[model samples]
Target: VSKANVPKIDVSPLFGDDQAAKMRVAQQIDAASRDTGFFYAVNHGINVQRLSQKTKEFHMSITPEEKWDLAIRAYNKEHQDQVRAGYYLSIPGKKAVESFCYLNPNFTPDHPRIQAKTPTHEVNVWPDETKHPGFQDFAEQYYWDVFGLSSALLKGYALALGKEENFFARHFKPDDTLASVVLIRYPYLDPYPEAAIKTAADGTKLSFEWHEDVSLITVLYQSNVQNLQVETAAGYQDIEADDTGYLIQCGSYMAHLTNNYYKAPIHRVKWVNAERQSLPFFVNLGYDSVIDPFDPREPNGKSDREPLSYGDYLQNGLVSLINKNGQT
Candidate 1:
């Protein structure tokens, strides 16, 4: 298959005080969201080189000692049929894929979820501070950096939809956000299990199955490899993101909130022989926020879908995974 042409949108304008450039950025984002529902965001202001180096160091060296305390028994997103079967990398070293995942570290005790003891919003269990020092600090900084970008992107999306600048942010608070930053490492599948493997015409191994993200907007910075592919009208197209760009895409939640004004793209990872890596920052809505179509074609510009708190909607989905994975 030929390489897909997802736009590399320059985002410097979004960071500036210039209205014209900002609006242009919004239009581009709108076009990409409406057309392909996928785009490579350039000048998004995250340091890709640093992100990659840190990821490499952590995945190769920092095997979470007593990692089981931090790791769960089964994967969390098991509700999706992802062909992901193997003893997940249980001392989990030689597995096809491995991830070090954590939710927003900014969630303080005063946060709503923390106040009420939300399951998914539980504070993270870090590696003993003395043992793994730099990573925890770097991880938190990087998460917040990406969080800032996600907030800015929300402004772009709001403008694209002809809404107020603080439209999405009016409800989403960084402290109450359910966002998560995942550090993923895809190694060479030497002990490749037959059942989980699927192949395309070009013989690239289907490492991760096709699925859309469950986030509001997923801000992803990945290793420079031809691993990700988005399902378009022309079939799956390779996402050849450059070194400086973050491959951003809307998720199911974004689609739901916008009444499908934007789209949630279905994407997957195809493994070549070499190792690959990616850091996907899922920027979600605040738990207490309501997700209802604000500008609908129906009466009062609202959709018929029942209004539900983001917390309530998220619970039903997280419940399925919790049931399969047991307590996290």
Candidate 2:
């Protein structure tokens, strides 16, 4: 089977004022988004190595006790599916580890929005500085750096969709930006139980069911595990890790905005023999942002769908992603 032939686009041009140069890259992104819902971006300033290095280091630096100290607090999992922000582990042995953080710094519990009660919009769960020196600072800085790249990419999307370069940017106010990073640890399942593994038709052991993301785009920085697979017309195909750049994929929000002009691909993870850590920075629109579609193809005929808020739409999707059974 041929591997997923996702395009690799150089997006540096999008950051400059050269309209012609920016459009060239935008067109490629347009084509990739329409066809594969995926692309590997190069010349995009962030260093994937450093992010992945930090990912590995952060995961390695924490212990079970430290993780629990940072775990999301739940009032009562039996009655509440939504929990506080911080760290999460599906089950002690399940090894489903995740550390989450949001874009803006003022998202503390006392912030107006948090005080008014927004889900996972609370302050990040951080390891004590005495125990994990510099991690909190690194996480905060990395969020903004990746968030900048995400903004530049959104401008490319605007141009590709027949709007001004700043059309999308105009709606993404920095203060309300809902972007986030989820540092995930995929533990190895040596001698894994058959009950836990979902075998593919060709016998590839799959670790997770195929699913689409909820963000507008997800910038995935993966170590060279080669466990990611995307479904193509040719059938399921492997995505070889390219340490050179971040992997970009359209998310459900893209589909919502474009009315499905860009596909939000269904993909799954293959069973890797060893542990792996992946950094996925979710590029989301600002909370309370409009979800109304302005179809570029028919600019004046805006979508008939009722107006929806990004925050509202996000909760609809995010709430289900949580493992309520494991949240306790």
Candidate 3:
């Protein structure tokens, strides 16, 4: 599908008193969610410059050598605290994609669930504050900012779902929810000759494999680098980066809540020759909150399955992903 086909909705309308204008944006959201499971939002009011710079600083603060050091240390069971706190790197194979995870500080090691090693409750691991200086502050600030944007967007989603604007707002309380921001860097291949670039059965090199995010929604900021693709009826299509917009996509939780009335598109990143970086803020509900079908039409069928707590589902989903990677 042409880039023009991807709806670009202006979110500034939602902040004002014009109910009519808000509804118009809501209609756009409903249409895009049903048709593509994706939408590009402009005028989102996020401070992208601050986010961008902090992202750059955080990534740059740790060099390739240091990252490898931390990765090997975490993998070898040395510095158990860092590993337990969710500071680890995964290098599946040579020249393959590598990822570093820093969990949200809200879910710290002292949290009972985290102490129990419950999935998703892992405390964030970080480089020493003395070394990185503002890394912790930058990460926390960015997470909260993106989270605020997600909350604002959720208001539009609620309106699109035929509920009051604040309907979903209350579901996300800062200290109560399970959320995180992941920074992914795809290094340029020229300098990283040993990088393992995977290929599809059809021989297309991949930066990231095809997968759907397992969250209620994901707010993504794709920097100047390109090659991110989303699957549609037209098949895989490149997503152009928008200087003023952020990409919002529905997730499995949204599909479950709406009984599949909304879709969670399958997407992947293809390796481009340039270095690429992306920050995706995952929005989720309170751990113990139960998710029931929100759509009155019940498109997926009657609900016979017992309602599951957000924590239970999140734990299982995360565990599955971890296990899948382990086998590979």
Candidate 4:
């Protein structure tokens, strides 16, 4: 599909349609398995208005300078901790800055689930809300929207695997543990010439090196400018923004779970001229959740299946992030 008419797989049809929906889901899965391994989701049933408002609130809540401050603080904290533990960290070579905000898995000290003080969930660092009224409300509403959207997407995946639609949910009971979301900010960077910097003879420069996402799926919305790129048979290509539609992509966890049937696209964000912001609502299984592939034709489909845990993947991700940003 050309850029103007990128193929969109709308799974809404399967929600109430059952058999026919499963057939379509399988078709999309096949397409992803063979082709892009990536596709835009339309008719995704996410609250567009709520998403829009949340985007606005996020922008209003944090300023350009504040973003930098948050980034430095986050980096420093991770850096000192890593040093205290006497270990090295990987620094993100990208020029952009970032901050983390959360939705589910509230980092409440009094909460029964968590006894530690680490920020593991969507913890809001509110600024002056008078300038941005209803900021908290918008965040809460967006959380619900993301929760439903994540569930629906998982259901589609189940149908594609020839199982009942709600099969994934059954494995993810107790809402308190199964769902999560994150709000990320990529502040603007002063433009620099692409060629000013030099790379080794190898084609692989520090161009946000080829890496796969570790989440189940990532739903991203870019505002202002575009800098996100995806690897293809041809080469790495940027994903531009449009008036409507969020740029969504699959991740490595799913790729591994699917036995490489649906490979995760290697992607990165290169430095761009203008300020850019994007929100990626990450859909993930519970930290302790284990995923195993299954097939109706094989009696041992569920048996002998390897278990995949979200917690382990998350620790690795944190290490990578800290390594890339830690300071002296």
lDDT of each: 0.71, 0.74, 0.71, 0.55
| lDDT of model 2 at position 230 | 90
Task: Please list the residue runs of candidate 2 whose C-alpha ends up more than 4 Å from where it truly belongs after superposition.
Answer: 74-84, 90-103, 193-196, 200-203, 297-302, 323-328
The 10 consecutive residues of candidate 4 with the worst lDDT sum are: 81-90
Which candidate wins on TM-score?
2
Q: What is the C-alpha local distance difference test score of candidate 2?
A: 0.74
Q: Estimate each model's TM-score.
A: 0.85, 0.89, 0.85, 0.74
User: Could you give candidate 1's per-residue lDDT for residues 22-137 as a string of tens digits?
Assistant: 89999999889987788888888788899898878777775544344455436424322211111123223323566777777876666676778665565655666666668889
> What TM-score does structure 3 among the candidates reach?
0.85
Better of 2 and 3 by TM-score: 2
RMSD of each: 4.9, 3.0, 3.3, 5.6
What's the true lDDT of residue 223 in model 3?
76
Steric clash pairs (candidate 4): 89-323, 90-323, 90-324, 91-323, 91-324, 92-324, 102-122, 103-122
TM-score of 4: 0.74
- Model 1: weakest 10-residue lDDT segment is 79-88
Better of 2 and 4 by TM-score: 2
